[PDB]
Amino acid sequence: SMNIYLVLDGSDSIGASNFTGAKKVLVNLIEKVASYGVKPRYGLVTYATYPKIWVKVSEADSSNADWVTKQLNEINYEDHKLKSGTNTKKALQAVYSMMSWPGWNRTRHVIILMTDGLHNMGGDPITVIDEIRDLLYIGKDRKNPREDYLDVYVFGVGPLVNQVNINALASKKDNEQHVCKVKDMECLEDVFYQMIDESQSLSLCGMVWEHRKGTDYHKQPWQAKISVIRKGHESCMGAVVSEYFVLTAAHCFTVDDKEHSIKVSVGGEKRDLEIEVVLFHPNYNINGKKEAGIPEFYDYDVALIKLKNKLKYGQTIRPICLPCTEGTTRALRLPPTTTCQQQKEELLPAQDIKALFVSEEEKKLTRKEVYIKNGDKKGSCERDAQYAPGYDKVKDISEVVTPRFLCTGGVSPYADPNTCRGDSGGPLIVHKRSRFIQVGVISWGVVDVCKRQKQVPAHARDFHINLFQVLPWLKEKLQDEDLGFL
Numbered sequence: 185s186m187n188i189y190l191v192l193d194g195s196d197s198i199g200a201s202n203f204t205g206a207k208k209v210l211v212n213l214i215e216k217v218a219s220y221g222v223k224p225r226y227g228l229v230t231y232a233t234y235p236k237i238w239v240k241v242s243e244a245d246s247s248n249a250d251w252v253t254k255q256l257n258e259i260n261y262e263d264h265k266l267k268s269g270t271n272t273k274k275a276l277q278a279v280y281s282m283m284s285w286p287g288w289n290r291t292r293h294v295i296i297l298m299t300d301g302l303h304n305m306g307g308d309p310i311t312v313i314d315e316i317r318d319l320l321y322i323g324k325d326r327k328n329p330r331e332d333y334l335d336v337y338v339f340g341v342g343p344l345v346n347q348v349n350i351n352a353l354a355s356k357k358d359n360e361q362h363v364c365k366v367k368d369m370e371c372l373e374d375v376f377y378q379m380i381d382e383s384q385s386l387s388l389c390g391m392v393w394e395h396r397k398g399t400d401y402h403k404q405p406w407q408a409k410i411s412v413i414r415k416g417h418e419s420c421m422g423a424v425v426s427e428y429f430v431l432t433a434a435h436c437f438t439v440d441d442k443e444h445s446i447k448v449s450v451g452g453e454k455r456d457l458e459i460e461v462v463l464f465h466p467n468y469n470i471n472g473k474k475e476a477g478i479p480e481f482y483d484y485d486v487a488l489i490k491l492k493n494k495l496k497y498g499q500t501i502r503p504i505c506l507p508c509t510e511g512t513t514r515a516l517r518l519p520p521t522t523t524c525q526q527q528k529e530e531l532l533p534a535q536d537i538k539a540l541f542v543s544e545e546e547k548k549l550t551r552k553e554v555y556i557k558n559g560d561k562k563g564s565c566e567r568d569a570q571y572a573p574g575y576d577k578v579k580d581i582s583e584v585v586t587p588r589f590l591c592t593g594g595v596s597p598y599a600d601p602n603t604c605r606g607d608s609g610g611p612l613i614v615h616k617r618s619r620f621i622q623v624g625v626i627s628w629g630v631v632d633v634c635k636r637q638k639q640v641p642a643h644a645r646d647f648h649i650n651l652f653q654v655l656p657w658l659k660e661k662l663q664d665e666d667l668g669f670l
């Protein structure tokens with residue numbers, strides 16, 4: 185159990201612009217905490233001469249991150265009156281009231297105070313912290329000091345901050361920093377990682393460690409690089425979907441590729457991983473429609489690689505969320521009664537869908553933003569497939585562009601970058617609730633525009649396998665991977 189008390193100075197010396205900026209910091213904090221699957225109870229207080237309580241921890245809705253964010257969003261600087269005074273002592277007493285009683289020893293308390301430290305009313309605020317420590321039995325007995333149950337963070341607001349007062353109120357813990365200037369984004373970023381336990385979220389799909397010290401492996405933890413030694417060697421990308429499986433494209437391999445010639449690499453490890461076997465989608469067949477004028481048919485272009493050794497999740501090796509699983513429901517912060525159709529309506533709505541994929545560019549991994557044409561622009565994106573090499577004589581183009589495909593690329597609504605051969609097998613991702621959900625697998629394209637090319641044609645479209653359209657296979661092959669498919 186955890187309680188987070190947001191206390192915002194709304195006095196005269198803060199000013200409108202910086203008061204709003206302060207809320208932004210808090211809004212972003214709530215969002216990031218929620219993204220980690222953590223559900224604390226929130227206290228929301230603004231103050232000047234007196235405190236104004238917007239949210240109390242005892243309220244049932246205090247643990248609803250959307251509701252709290254809504255409250256914070258509605259708070260207007262001018263709402264808080266009597267700005268000529270600044271009584272920080274009182275602000276902390278309001279927090280004291282939320283803790284006092286008319287399993288307590290199991291609740292952790294985190295106070296986040298945003299002020300310039302210039303109180304000109306009431307006594308010394310330090311006194312209240314002392315009362316709070318006493319109330320929570322902290323620093324009273326060795327072997328049970330319970331220092332872990334309280335954290336007092338003070339974020340200095342504005343250009344004219346009184347460093348001494350701010351330092352005085354903040355917790356004092358070894359190897360930790362509890363004081364930050366609001367504009368010092370490095371410090372604020374470090375605070376988060378001192379507050380939330382990374383361990384409690386290792387089993388969560390679509391998670392990324394976003395710290396500034398992070399590497400490409402940290403930013404794309406699910407990313408797997410696949411090598412096939414043959415003839416000309418093959419290179420494909422893939423995504424970790426479970427401790428044993430990596431999802432990629434079927435065309436990356438042939439029935440003539442032997443297990444030992446296929447190596448997988450993850451997490452920035454120097455070593456390669458050995459595979460047990462490749463599971464091609466049963467309906468995949470690149471020569472299945474030659475008669476219809478389709479030299480290579482990419483329908484059902486997906487495959488699951490079962491590794492020999494089970495992976496262990498860490499900040500450089502994590503699974504990406506898959507459609508219609510309980511993991512994606514939680515990642516989206518939706519009730520347990522959510523259905524596959526509902527996740528679909530949320531992830532793949534009938535419109536241009538903001539999405540992204542990853543592309544290696546000379547050792548480094550980069551994110552490419554694209555738009556999935558799933559609205560009244562879809563038919564046009566698909567028809568451009570008629571301009572693909574070897575597809576000039578396909579009778580009905582909808583015979584090559586099956587319902588299994590998602591379509592991206594083009595100049596509308598935006599100039600979409602294109603996938604390169606090396607990106608094939610990689611995941612087409614949707615970024616929601618600060619989490620990453622895989623909606624497709626990079627398969628093929630119409631125009632060869634890879635270095636990425638200068639300017640590309642308006643018909644340079646790319647196709648990807650819609651995971652929603654191969655769910656029965658994913659659910660069947662991954663039934664024992666504890667992913668909780670719906």
Ligand SMILES: *C(=O)c1ccc(NC(=N)N)cc1
Pocket residue numbers: 603604605606607608609626627628629630631632633646
């Ligand atoms: C994957 O192997 C892949 C993806 C996209 C393309 N683009 C084009 N053929 N234009 C090729 C290969």
Ligand SMILES: [Mg+2]
Pocket residue numbers: 195196197198269270302303
């Ligand atoms: Mg003031």
Ligand code: NA
Pocket residue numbers: 250251254
């Ligand atoms: Na709400």
Ligand code: NA
Pocket residue numbers: 323324325326329
């Ligand atoms: Na002690």
Ligand code: NA
Pocket residue numbers: 382383
């Ligand atoms: Na950890």
Ligand code: NA
Pocket residue numbers: none
């Ligand atoms: Na480390």
Ligand code: NA
Pocket residue numbers: 510513514519520
């Ligand atoms: Na659930």
Ligand code: NA
Pocket residue numbers: 528532650652653
């Ligand atoms: Na769909």
